[PDB]
């Protein structure tokens, strides 16, 4: 029933995740992953207790916009993906079908330059390298979009402030005009009689 | 002294990885990453007692090509990144900088309709959706590429063998032509 | 140690005046003078048990403004003047001055037609009638003024509300104009900065395009050579 | 039965009012209103045993000029108003209609400067002070007229005395001439 | 025979003397009262001219205040 | 001396155009371009007698704002670019390219399906269609913007009138406040002077009265003694 | 019957157009618009002797891709927009009804600064400046795309030559194998 | 046919008087009475060309208020009283009746004191002194009232300015409100349709 | 040496007023002032050769009584005031004033309804009307008093004759009483 | 037949040699163009980085001016 939180704000402690998601339900544990240095990765894993509470938090953060601090960047919440580096693949776990024996004609070794395995591993490695280049391109695209959004933050804030206060001014001007005219016709209808 | 191993066959095992990288030095622990269901994730980690042994393994699989499977799938090894799971960023370290105190004063919330925070958070969410669709596109591209490159497995072997037969037949013809004349 | 409050509303009573003026000191008696029918005369007397507190109340209602009712009828306070009703000026005190006795020597009378006393009493009576007319004139003038001032109960209230609102709206418009001008300057400088940025990017991109063109030309040359 | 005799002489007594108005009837109580120091206020307060005596007294002292002593200033006599400060204003006797509630929306209190209440109370206070100025102006006018009319008393007294003497002499002279002529015309015939 | 005439002359002389005495008294009162009146009249005239002088001086002081007041209004 | 004129109303005729720019110089011929069906295209070319007149018009319309009609549609002017349709690019001018002669060797054709020229012609066709789409989109957005401006003639006009009236009213209110306060001060000074004069008058009158009553008393005493 | 051809190649001439566009029928004249200096403008003008030939030409050069040089840049053919700069719209041609009368309420003169007329002068000028900016941006996008496509010419040509040669080679090798096997099975 | 104008302003001329009164007609001679020492006497004399124009001027200056300078003091216009101080009253022009005879019974001389003539002459002289005192009292009353009205030159001016301009401001405010609501209802009906 | 003499009867003359006053000095000229109809206004003018003579005349007719008619109405003299109706104030003296020039800047007008000048001209008109009423009242009081003094013209004369007769009789009676008592005590 | 088959095989061998030469020249093409494209992408990324740092310093300066005012 665990959940993970993505694109976390730059300044944060464990306690922010502990208490901020507490509105959805009780939180057993809440952690913010950190590298060897002290710079957290921007990802966080929260340990919930009940699965219904986990579903409620997940879909509430999905359709809603959980803003965690004054920096107006919502945190994106997705289910935790469980990885198990302890059990692994014991030999008895493998089905050992005819595929495995076909998969095990030769012991794991290198590739001699010039044999078919080598020219085919070259194609595989080229595919992997182009995947890595594509992933880096996507990362760069998102980074250069988010920096632009961080820049435009201030202009957006000031524009919204102006829009709100102008609409308020228009509303209260209309209120003044309404009261004034209303008093006018009521005094007129009082004096006519 | 650890390496993160990926591009692994679906039919690899812990002992297969251990015996593959054991030629490079003593092993301490090499395990295969599996999901909740226990399915193979195609990744893994290998941990070596001495750092220079890990370095030799990394370079030897980097410039060289190392196979685990009859299917010519290469193995790519890169230094593992260490991320502690159970020990986050303590609040005492958080308060060291002067910006966290002036930054925390606003409590967690949800934004209100019509507020600037909600309006801007909508754009942030749209950016998140764009990023997710781009990532899914790249993942689908590699699904296509893997499925394709598995298709010409037999065809490439057949054409390579045919090419070898053509070359040695040609050299036989050449030597016979030199012999008869 | 008493104060004479006046200008009271017709709907005030004893206990209202007792509780309103008790702020400044203790209260022993405070009665709103009523006529023979009991209808409110608009005046009252408040006899404080404490002289200093009464003086404090007098001063605070003098420079300050005190009210008693939704309609703004300020209550005005003056120290009370005491006149002794059921005792007055006895015979003995008057006869201390011997000269009183040559005033009483002529008995009370009516004056007689043609006597000088009659001819003078007529002038005195004319003066009394003229004084009465002047008093009636002042009373009517102030009744008219009060009745008029009652009429602007609502007009002045409306004008005050409208003035507060228009002043509020004016300062709002000033703040809006300040924000508009400052933010317009913000946007203009941002725009000029990004124009400079993209011009620099343009020049760099053109130099890039030329480099790739020379690549293509030299490579075409090499391919022709081979 | 009450009256209120005004403009009293400078030198009066309780029994002067008890005896002078004894002419119109029985004066149970007439007591010149006196202030604290003991000087007269300038008014009176008379109570008869019956109403009709009081009405007759008012009418006579209105059409006549009831001089009190030798100083020729008649006393203005007016009916008395009964200002009651005994029952005051009992709470249960007020109308307590919707007007009371309209007037009792907010409690007694001061006016906050710059508010509407303070601005309006300024207008009311100005009205009251202007009324007080007008009343003091009327008091000043009547005082100066009264002092002028007290000063010229000797002039008018001696003027009337001389006129009476002259008319009396003319009457005596005409009587002399008439009697002498009558005697002459009767002795001739 | 001269009885009624003697009584008539006696009474007429007596009342003529009375009338003469009353006329003398009237003349004395007239002259004294006219003297009193003349003194009061001259006092009235003196007080009136003093009042005139005071009112004139107060009016010129008001005039000076008014011209200085208008000078201040013009300057502002 | 021709200057390009555009963003002009469809009701201005040739002669209105020639009269409007006459103040910058003589009009040899002022014409607004028209299409086949006869409606004015909103763009025109006006020919001036002298180069200085055209340059003066271009400048003065550049820094300033020119108008022509009740509708406030400012005229934007640019220098003309001349084009020709009877004379093209003749051969003696054209053959001079060294490679044109070797470039013509292929006859102009439609390429063929499957060849490279056709497979690349399709890419150029796609680019041309994209360009057409973008131009259409700009034109649609703009027509929309001009229609939005046309709608807002009355609203902003009335708003401008109301703002001018409100500013005038505020100025008059300020003048009223100044006059009120100054007049109130004037009255306060007059009232103070009047009350001072009244007090002096009352004191002087009391003095004259006390002298008069003393003089009356002396007259009475002398009368009593004479009696 | 007139048509305007765009995106003509870098090296174009009058007889280049007259001969290329004579396949669609007899023509009177076609010209290549030139700037005042004497450089090509990238636009053409072609006239015909009638409708059906010109309409067939438009349909073919729209559905087809008419190259008129080795450089694989097909032309764009549209119908020429006939603009008149002679007649204008004189007084005897304007409707002159009440639409013009309120239009003809002020003389043509400058707007007084700091007024309502000057305010819409600024507004319309801002709109027109935005128009110039947007048209320039579109031309910019098209210019960068055209440069990219022009540079990918030679690489694409060589890749296509490789593809065609490989397809030919597969076909020929398959034919040789079939002709070997049929003869072997026949004898 | 000559009128008299009174209460002239402090600074006046023959020319101011003739130019001011020429509107009613042609002025044969307008003059401003002056005493010996050059100070204005506060009176005028105007002669028109005949009865009709003079009568019109008299009516218009009576019912109107003709100011002839910046000082708001109208001039009161009255027909002139010509006093023939040349012909006098010659003996031939006396009726010389028995009234003249009984008037001429004693030569013009002093009255010897203590006679009847002296007492009667003192009676008439006392009457004349009382009349002169009355005229001086009326003159003094008018002088004091004039000085009072001259003091309120400025207070009345400023009060009238303030009242007139406040009324103008109220009218302008009503005009603004009427135009604003007018346009509002116009656009409301036009958007409704 | 001009003496403004008034309070005279309508039957006086240029001759009677020049025969009466010829005692004080030489007659320069004495005229009665008559209105348009010629009926005496009841005033006159008298001038003398030497100012010393005119001042003696003033003092004598001031301290004493000068009577000119059988009906005892005194002749009252005053110094004559110098007023001229031709040489009004000149502009060379009018314009020396500094505030005169800024006093004429507003032309002679009629005020206008609602304006301050018309609002204040009404107060001036009211003052003029009440002054007119007071002057008319004084003139009517003097008419009453003079017409009264005409009424007792004869009654006072008869009373004066009677008073002197009665005083003479009183003196005669006193003298005869003393004579009779003297003769009685003689016997 | 054998003569014709030999001619067809010889033609095929010549065509394979020509194809191999064309393929390897295109391999150099992709190598050179791809390495230049990576170089120029690195240059543009660096230029954009020093472009964004300038915007950051402008933003901090403008915010400081905001707070001071």
PDB file of N, CA and C in Angstrom, chain C residues 50-119:
ATOM      1  N   UNK C  50     -21.621  61.442  43.824  1.00  0.00           N
ATOM      2  CA  UNK C  50     -20.215  61.794  43.917  1.00  0.00           C
ATOM      3  C   UNK C  50     -19.948  63.030  43.074  1.00  0.00           C
ATOM      4  N   UNK C  51     -19.429  64.076  43.714  1.00  0.00           N
ATOM      5  CA  UNK C  51     -19.125  65.319  43.008  1.00  0.00           C
ATOM      6  C   UNK C  51     -18.025  65.170  41.961  1.00  0.00           C
ATOM      7  N   UNK C  52     -16.852  64.593  42.260  1.00  0.00           N
ATOM      8  CA  UNK C  52     -15.813  64.514  41.218  1.00  0.00           C
ATOM      9  C   UNK C  52     -16.242  63.716  40.002  1.00  0.00           C
ATOM     10  N   UNK C  53     -16.958  62.611  40.208  1.00  0.00           N
ATOM     11  CA  UNK C  53     -17.443  61.829  39.077  1.00  0.00           C
ATOM     12  C   UNK C  53     -18.438  62.626  38.247  1.00  0.00           C
ATOM     13  N   UNK C  54     -19.307  63.392  38.910  1.00  0.00           N
ATOM     14  CA  UNK C  54     -20.247  64.241  38.188  1.00  0.00           C
ATOM     15  C   UNK C  54     -19.511  65.268  37.341  1.00  0.00           C
ATOM     16  N   UNK C  55     -18.451  65.869  37.887  1.00  0.00           N
ATOM     17  CA  UNK C  55     -17.671  66.827  37.107  1.00  0.00           C
ATOM     18  C   UNK C  55     -16.991  66.151  35.925  1.00  0.00           C
ATOM     19  N   UNK C  56     -16.469  64.940  36.134  1.00  0.00           N
ATOM     20  CA  UNK C  56     -15.857  64.207  35.032  1.00  0.00           C
ATOM     21  C   UNK C  56     -16.873  63.931  33.935  1.00  0.00           C
ATOM     22  N   UNK C  57     -18.085  63.523  34.317  1.00  0.00           N
ATOM     23  CA  UNK C  57     -19.137  63.288  33.333  1.00  0.00           C
ATOM     24  C   UNK C  57     -19.491  64.568  32.592  1.00  0.00           C
ATOM     25  N   UNK C  58     -19.604  65.681  33.323  1.00  0.00           N
ATOM     26  CA  UNK C  58     -19.890  66.966  32.694  1.00  0.00           C
ATOM     27  C   UNK C  58     -18.846  67.295  31.644  1.00  0.00           C
ATOM     28  N   UNK C  59     -17.573  67.179  32.009  1.00  0.00           N
ATOM     29  CA  UNK C  59     -16.516  67.499  31.063  1.00  0.00           C
ATOM     30  C   UNK C  59     -16.544  66.558  29.865  1.00  0.00           C
ATOM     31  N   UNK C  60     -16.678  65.255  30.113  1.00  0.00           N
ATOM     32  CA  UNK C  60     -16.564  64.284  29.032  1.00  0.00           C
ATOM     33  C   UNK C  60     -17.736  64.383  28.065  1.00  0.00           C
ATOM     34  N   UNK C  61     -18.922  64.733  28.563  1.00  0.00           N
ATOM     35  CA  UNK C  61     -20.032  65.034  27.670  1.00  0.00           C
ATOM     36  C   UNK C  61     -19.937  66.430  27.074  1.00  0.00           C
ATOM     37  N   UNK C  62     -19.108  67.305  27.645  1.00  0.00           N
ATOM     38  CA  UNK C  62     -18.939  68.640  27.089  1.00  0.00           C
ATOM     39  C   UNK C  62     -18.044  68.613  25.858  1.00  0.00           C
ATOM     40  N   UNK C  63     -16.775  68.233  26.030  1.00  0.00           N
ATOM     41  CA  UNK C  63     -15.902  68.156  24.860  1.00  0.00           C
ATOM     42  C   UNK C  63     -16.235  66.946  23.998  1.00  0.00           C
ATOM     43  N   UNK C  64     -16.558  65.815  24.618  1.00  0.00           N
ATOM     44  CA  UNK C  64     -16.973  64.650  23.873  1.00  0.00           C
ATOM     45  C   UNK C  64     -18.415  64.756  23.434  1.00  0.00           C
ATOM     46  N   UNK C  65     -18.843  63.758  22.668  1.00  0.00           N
ATOM     47  CA  UNK C  65     -20.221  63.652  22.207  1.00  0.00           C
ATOM     48  C   UNK C  65     -20.800  62.355  22.736  1.00  0.00           C
ATOM     49  N   UNK C  66     -21.921  62.449  23.436  1.00  0.00           N
ATOM     50  CA  UNK C  66     -22.583  61.284  23.990  1.00  0.00           C
ATOM     51  C   UNK C  66     -23.943  61.141  23.330  1.00  0.00           C
ATOM     52  N   UNK C  67     -24.394  59.906  23.178  1.00  0.00           N
ATOM     53  CA  UNK C  67     -25.673  59.628  22.549  1.00  0.00           C
ATOM     54  C   UNK C  67     -26.488  58.740  23.470  1.00  0.00           C
ATOM     55  N   UNK C  68     -27.738  58.497  23.096  1.00  0.00           N
ATOM     56  CA  UNK C  68     -28.602  57.615  23.861  1.00  0.00           C
ATOM     57  C   UNK C  68     -29.465  56.716  22.998  1.00  0.00           C
ATOM     58  N   UNK C  69     -29.374  56.822  21.679  1.00  0.00           N
ATOM     59  CA  UNK C  69     -30.386  56.240  20.814  1.00  0.00           C
ATOM     60  C   UNK C  69     -29.831  56.166  19.397  1.00  0.00           C
ATOM     61  N   UNK C  70     -30.422  55.283  18.586  1.00  0.00           N
ATOM     62  CA  UNK C  70     -30.000  55.132  17.197  1.00  0.00           C
ATOM     63  C   UNK C  70     -29.997  56.466  16.462  1.00  0.00           C
ATOM     64  N   UNK C  71     -31.057  57.248  16.611  1.00  0.00           N
ATOM     65  CA  UNK C  71     -31.065  58.588  16.040  1.00  0.00           C
ATOM     66  C   UNK C  71     -30.031  59.449  16.756  1.00  0.00           C
ATOM     67  N   UNK C  72     -29.120  60.078  16.036  1.00  0.00           N
ATOM     68  CA  UNK C  72     -28.043  60.828  16.695  1.00  0.00           C
ATOM     69  C   UNK C  72     -28.516  62.108  17.366  1.00  0.00           C
ATOM     70  N   UNK C  73     -29.080  61.985  18.569  1.00  0.00           N
ATOM     71  CA  UNK C  73     -29.480  63.130  19.378  1.00  0.00           C
ATOM     72  C   UNK C  73     -28.484  63.293  20.514  1.00  0.00           C
ATOM     73  N   UNK C  74     -27.465  64.133  20.359  1.00  0.00           N
ATOM     74  CA  UNK C  74     -26.472  64.286  21.423  1.00  0.00           C
ATOM     75  C   UNK C  74     -27.119  64.771  22.702  1.00  0.00           C
ATOM     76  N   UNK C  75     -26.638  64.255  23.822  1.00  0.00           N
ATOM     77  CA  UNK C  75     -27.148  64.628  25.129  1.00  0.00           C
ATOM     78  C   UNK C  75     -26.219  65.680  25.705  1.00  0.00           C
ATOM     79  N   UNK C  76     -26.778  66.826  26.053  1.00  0.00           N
ATOM     80  CA  UNK C  76     -26.018  67.976  26.519  1.00  0.00           C
ATOM     81  C   UNK C  76     -26.232  68.134  28.013  1.00  0.00           C
ATOM     82  N   UNK C  77     -25.118  68.361  28.720  1.00  0.00           N
ATOM     83  CA  UNK C  77     -25.191  68.396  30.208  1.00  0.00           C
ATOM     84  C   UNK C  77     -24.734  69.744  30.780  1.00  0.00           C
ATOM     85  N   UNK C  78     -25.537  70.326  31.664  1.00  0.00           N
ATOM     86  CA  UNK C  78     -25.190  71.535  32.392  1.00  0.00           C
ATOM     87  C   UNK C  78     -25.415  71.266  33.870  1.00  0.00           C
ATOM     88  N   UNK C  79     -24.667  71.927  34.752  1.00  0.00           N
ATOM     89  CA  UNK C  79     -24.921  71.766  36.187  1.00  0.00           C
ATOM     90  C   UNK C  79     -26.296  72.301  36.556  1.00  0.00           C
ATOM     91  N   UNK C  80     -26.954  71.611  37.479  1.00  0.00           N
ATOM     92  CA  UNK C  80     -28.312  71.964  37.860  1.00  0.00           C
ATOM     93  C   UNK C  80     -28.331  73.210  38.737  1.00  0.00           C
ATOM     94  N   UNK C  81     -29.371  74.019  38.557  1.00  0.00           N
ATOM     95  CA  UNK C  81     -29.636  75.179  39.397  1.00  0.00           C
ATOM     96  C   UNK C  81     -30.780  74.845  40.342  1.00  0.00           C
ATOM     97  N   UNK C  82     -30.586  75.124  41.626  1.00  0.00           N
ATOM     98  CA  UNK C  82     -31.543  74.750  42.656  1.00  0.00           C
ATOM     99  C   UNK C  82     -32.403  75.947  43.032  1.00  0.00           C
ATOM    100  N   UNK C  83     -33.719  75.762  42.980  1.00  0.00           N
ATOM    101  CA  UNK C  83     -34.682  76.777  43.381  1.00  0.00           C
ATOM    102  C   UNK C  83     -35.632  76.152  44.387  1.00  0.00           C
ATOM    103  N   UNK C  84     -35.800  76.804  45.532  1.00  0.00           N
ATOM    104  CA  UNK C  84     -36.524  76.197  46.638  1.00  0.00           C
ATOM    105  C   UNK C  84     -38.014  76.475  46.491  1.00  0.00           C
ATOM    106  N   UNK C  85     -38.797  75.411  46.321  1.00  0.00           N
ATOM    107  CA  UNK C  85     -40.213  75.557  46.007  1.00  0.00           C
ATOM    108  C   UNK C  85     -41.030  75.904  47.245  1.00  0.00           C
ATOM    109  N   UNK C  86     -41.096  74.993  48.216  1.00  0.00           N
ATOM    110  CA  UNK C  86     -42.064  75.128  49.300  1.00  0.00           C
ATOM    111  C   UNK C  86     -41.564  76.005  50.445  1.00  0.00           C
ATOM    112  N   UNK C  87     -40.347  76.526  50.358  1.00  0.00           N
ATOM    113  CA  UNK C  87     -39.900  77.634  51.189  1.00  0.00           C
ATOM    114  C   UNK C  87     -39.377  78.726  50.273  1.00  0.00           C
ATOM    115  N   UNK C  88     -39.483  79.971  50.722  1.00  0.00           N
ATOM    116  CA  UNK C  88     -39.042  81.083  49.911  1.00  0.00           C
ATOM    117  C   UNK C  88     -38.396  82.185  50.713  1.00  0.00           C
ATOM    118  N   UNK C  89     -38.828  83.424  50.488  1.00  0.00           N
ATOM    119  CA  UNK C  89     -38.271  84.586  51.170  1.00  0.00           C
ATOM    120  C   UNK C  89     -39.173  84.982  52.327  1.00  0.00           C
ATOM    121  N   UNK C  90     -38.802  84.704  53.574  1.00  0.00           N
ATOM    122  CA  UNK C  90     -39.685  85.036  54.695  1.00  0.00           C
ATOM    123  C   UNK C  90     -39.756  86.534  54.937  1.00  0.00           C
ATOM    124  N   UNK C  91     -40.674  86.909  55.829  1.00  0.00           N
ATOM    125  CA  UNK C  91     -40.836  88.317  56.175  1.00  0.00           C
ATOM    126  C   UNK C  91     -39.591  88.860  56.854  1.00  0.00           C
ATOM    127  N   UNK C  92     -39.018  88.079  57.772  1.00  0.00           N
ATOM    128  CA  UNK C  92     -37.944  88.574  58.626  1.00  0.00           C
ATOM    129  C   UNK C  92     -36.710  88.951  57.818  1.00  0.00           C
ATOM    130  N   UNK C  93     -36.340  88.122  56.842  1.00  0.00           N
ATOM    131  CA  UNK C  93     -35.163  88.417  56.033  1.00  0.00           C
ATOM    132  C   UNK C  93     -35.339  89.707  55.243  1.00  0.00           C
ATOM    133  N   UNK C  94     -36.534  89.928  54.692  1.00  0.00           N
ATOM    134  CA  UNK C  94     -36.783  91.142  53.922  1.00  0.00           C
ATOM    135  C   UNK C  94     -36.660  92.386  54.794  1.00  0.00           C
ATOM    136  N   UNK C  95     -37.222  92.338  56.002  1.00  0.00           N
ATOM    137  CA  UNK C  95     -37.256  93.496  56.881  1.00  0.00           C
ATOM    138  C   UNK C  95     -35.892  93.825  57.460  1.00  0.00           C
ATOM    139  N   UNK C  96     -34.859  93.043  57.136  1.00  0.00           N
ATOM    140  CA  UNK C  96     -33.500  93.414  57.519  1.00  0.00           C
ATOM    141  C   UNK C  96     -33.091  94.734  56.875  1.00  0.00           C
ATOM    142  N   UNK C  97     -33.369  94.893  55.592  1.00  0.00           N
ATOM    143  CA  UNK C  97     -33.227  96.192  54.956  1.00  0.00           C
ATOM    144  C   UNK C  97     -34.387  97.072  55.396  1.00  0.00           C
ATOM    145  N   UNK C  98     -34.137  98.184  56.086  1.00  0.00           N
ATOM    146  CA  UNK C  98     -35.254  99.045  56.505  1.00  0.00           C
ATOM    147  C   UNK C  98     -36.028  99.626  55.339  1.00  0.00           C
ATOM    148  N   UNK C  99     -35.419  99.689  54.154  1.00  0.00           N
ATOM    149  CA  UNK C  99     -36.018 100.402  53.031  1.00  0.00           C
ATOM    150  C   UNK C  99     -37.150  99.601  52.391  1.00  0.00           C
ATOM    151  N   UNK C 100     -37.189  98.283  52.610  1.00  0.00           N
ATOM    152  CA  UNK C 100     -38.352  97.509  52.188  1.00  0.00           C
ATOM    153  C   UNK C 100     -39.636  98.081  52.762  1.00  0.00           C
ATOM    154  N   UNK C 101     -39.590  98.601  53.987  1.00  0.00           N
ATOM    155  CA  UNK C 101     -40.800  99.075  54.640  1.00  0.00           C
ATOM    156  C   UNK C 101     -41.403 100.306  53.978  1.00  0.00           C
ATOM    157  N   UNK C 102     -40.635 101.078  53.213  1.00  0.00           N
ATOM    158  CA  UNK C 102     -41.228 102.175  52.463  1.00  0.00           C
ATOM    159  C   UNK C 102     -41.620 101.768  51.050  1.00  0.00           C
ATOM    160  N   UNK C 103     -41.463 100.494  50.700  1.00  0.00           N
ATOM    161  CA  UNK C 103     -42.022  99.968  49.465  1.00  0.00           C
ATOM    162  C   UNK C 103     -43.389  99.349  49.703  1.00  0.00           C
ATOM    163  N   UNK C 104     -43.552  98.656  50.827  1.00  0.00           N
ATOM    164  CA  UNK C 104     -44.817  98.015  51.162  1.00  0.00           C
ATOM    165  C   UNK C 104     -45.872  99.009  51.631  1.00  0.00           C
ATOM    166  N   UNK C 105     -45.479 100.243  51.963  1.00  0.00           N
ATOM    167  CA  UNK C 105     -46.426 101.173  52.572  1.00  0.00           C
ATOM    168  C   UNK C 105     -47.651 101.397  51.696  1.00  0.00           C
ATOM    169  N   UNK C 106     -47.491 101.360  50.379  1.00  0.00           N
ATOM    170  CA  UNK C 106     -48.637 101.439  49.484  1.00  0.00           C
ATOM    171  C   UNK C 106     -49.234 100.049  49.313  1.00  0.00           C
ATOM    172  N   UNK C 107     -50.514  99.845  49.623  1.00  0.00           N
ATOM    173  CA  UNK C 107     -51.058  98.494  49.599  1.00  0.00           C
ATOM    174  C   UNK C 107     -51.143  97.972  48.175  1.00  0.00           C
ATOM    175  N   UNK C 108     -51.115  96.653  47.991  1.00  0.00           N
ATOM    176  CA  UNK C 108     -51.337  96.089  46.654  1.00  0.00           C
ATOM    177  C   UNK C 108     -52.672  96.529  46.078  1.00  0.00           C
ATOM    178  N   UNK C 109     -52.661  96.898  44.802  1.00  0.00           N
ATOM    179  CA  UNK C 109     -53.820  97.533  44.193  1.00  0.00           C
ATOM    180  C   UNK C 109     -53.838  97.207  42.705  1.00  0.00           C
ATOM    181  N   UNK C 110     -54.764  97.837  41.972  1.00  0.00           N
ATOM    182  CA  UNK C 110     -54.944  97.614  40.539  1.00  0.00           C
ATOM    183  C   UNK C 110     -54.471  98.747  39.646  1.00  0.00           C
ATOM    184  N   UNK C 111     -54.083  99.892  40.203  1.00  0.00           N
ATOM    185  CA  UNK C 111     -53.980 101.150  39.467  1.00  0.00           C
ATOM    186  C   UNK C 111     -55.350 101.582  38.958  1.00  0.00           C
ATOM    187  N   UNK C 112     -55.524 102.873  38.700  1.00  0.00           N
ATOM    188  CA  UNK C 112     -56.829 103.423  38.375  1.00  0.00           C
ATOM    189  C   UNK C 112     -56.752 104.231  37.092  1.00  0.00           C
ATOM    190  N   UNK C 113     -57.824 104.155  36.307  1.00  0.00           N
ATOM    191  CA  UNK C 113     -57.856 104.799  35.001  1.00  0.00           C
ATOM    192  C   UNK C 113     -57.546 106.280  35.136  1.00  0.00           C
ATOM    193  N   UNK C 114     -56.490 106.718  34.459  1.00  0.00           N
ATOM    194  CA  UNK C 114     -56.042 108.086  34.507  1.00  0.00           C
ATOM    195  C   UNK C 114     -54.906 108.347  35.474  1.00  0.00           C
ATOM    196  N   UNK C 115     -54.699 107.471  36.452  1.00  0.00           N
ATOM    197  CA  UNK C 115     -53.583 107.640  37.364  1.00  0.00           C
ATOM    198  C   UNK C 115     -52.278 107.317  36.647  1.00  0.00           C
ATOM    199  N   UNK C 116     -51.192 107.939  37.112  1.00  0.00           N
ATOM    200  CA  UNK C 116     -49.891 107.703  36.496  1.00  0.00           C
ATOM    201  C   UNK C 116     -49.507 106.236  36.567  1.00  0.00           C
ATOM    202  N   UNK C 117     -49.869 105.563  37.659  1.00  0.00           N
ATOM    203  CA  UNK C 117     -49.541 104.151  37.791  1.00  0.00           C
ATOM    204  C   UNK C 117     -50.189 103.333  36.688  1.00  0.00           C
ATOM    205  N   UNK C 118     -51.429 103.656  36.322  1.00  0.00           N
ATOM    206  CA  UNK C 118     -52.057 102.996  35.182  1.00  0.00           C
ATOM    207  C   UNK C 118     -51.340 103.334  33.879  1.00  0.00           C
ATOM    208  N   UNK C 119     -51.024 104.612  33.679  1.00  0.00           N
ATOM    209  CA  UNK C 119     -50.396 105.039  32.437  1.00  0.00           C
ATOM    210  C   UNK C 119     -49.016 104.422  32.265  1.00  0.00           C
TER     211      UNK C 119
END
